[PDB]
Amino acid sequence: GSEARECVNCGATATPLWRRDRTGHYLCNACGLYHKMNGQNRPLIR
Ligand SMILES: [Zn+2]
């Protein structure tokens, strides 16, 4: 699978708009919210 992009955080490949950061990643939307206010990386689980 992995058709569209894969959110480096949750793998969400159905986001409305991707966005890379200093690491050039591709979060889906809420996974970057932390880097926006907290600035740190997102924990998540895998
Ligand atoms: Zn995500």
Side-chain angles (χ1 to χ4, degrees):
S2 92
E3 171 148 63
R5 228 88 259 200
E6 252 170 20
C7 183
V8 295
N9 270 203
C10 76
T13 164
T15 173
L17 207 80
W18 294 89
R19 197 59 167 283
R20 319 114 91 214
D21 43 16
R22 240 100 274 258
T23 74
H25 275 153
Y26 271 121
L27 288 170
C28 62
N29 234 35
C31 283
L33 230 176
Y34 210 63
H35 209 242
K36 305 218 87 180
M37 276 235 183
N38 279 80
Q40 278 183 243
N41 277 112
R42 208 60 145 91
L44 314 164
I45 284 299
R46 241 219 271 197

